[PDB]
Amino acid sequence: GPLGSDASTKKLSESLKRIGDELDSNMELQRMIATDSPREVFFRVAADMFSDGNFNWGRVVALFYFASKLVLKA
Amino acid sequence: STKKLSESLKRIGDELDSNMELQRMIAAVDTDSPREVFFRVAADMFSDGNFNWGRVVALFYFASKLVLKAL
Amino acid sequence: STKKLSESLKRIGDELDSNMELQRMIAAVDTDSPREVFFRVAADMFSDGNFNWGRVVALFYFASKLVLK
Amino acid sequence: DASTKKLSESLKRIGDELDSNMELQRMIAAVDTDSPREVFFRVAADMFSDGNFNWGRVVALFYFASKLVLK
Ligand SMILES: [Zn+2]
Ligand SMILES: [Zn+2]
Ligand SMILES: [Zn+2]
Ligand SMILES: [Zn+2]
> What is the residue extent of each domain of chain B?
2-69
Estimate the share of chain C in helix, then strand, then coil, as percent rounded to the nearest 5.
Answer: 70, 0, 30
Task: Provide the CATH number for the domain formed by D32-71 in this structure.
Answer: 1.10.437.10
Calculate the alpha carbon distances from D25 to B17, B32, B49, C3, C11 in Å: 26, 24, 38, 15, 15
* Cα of C21 vs its chain's centroid, Å: 12
- Give me the architecture of the C2-67 domain, per CATH: Orthogonal Bundle (1.10)
Homologous superfamily, domain B2-69: Blc2-like (1.10.437.10)
Distance between CA A31 and CA D26 in Å, rounded?
41
Set of chain C residues whose Cβ sits within 8 Å of the Cβ of D14: 16, 22, 54, 58, 61
Technique of determination: X-ray
State how far the Cα of B23 lies from the Cα of B17, in Å rounded to an integer. Answer: 7
Q: Give the Cα separation of B26 and B44 in Å (integer).
A: 15
Tell me if A56 and B10 make a contact (CB, 8 A cut-off). no
CATH superfamily of A3-73: Blc2-like (1.10.437.10)
Chains that touch C (3 or more CB pairs under 8 A): A, B, D
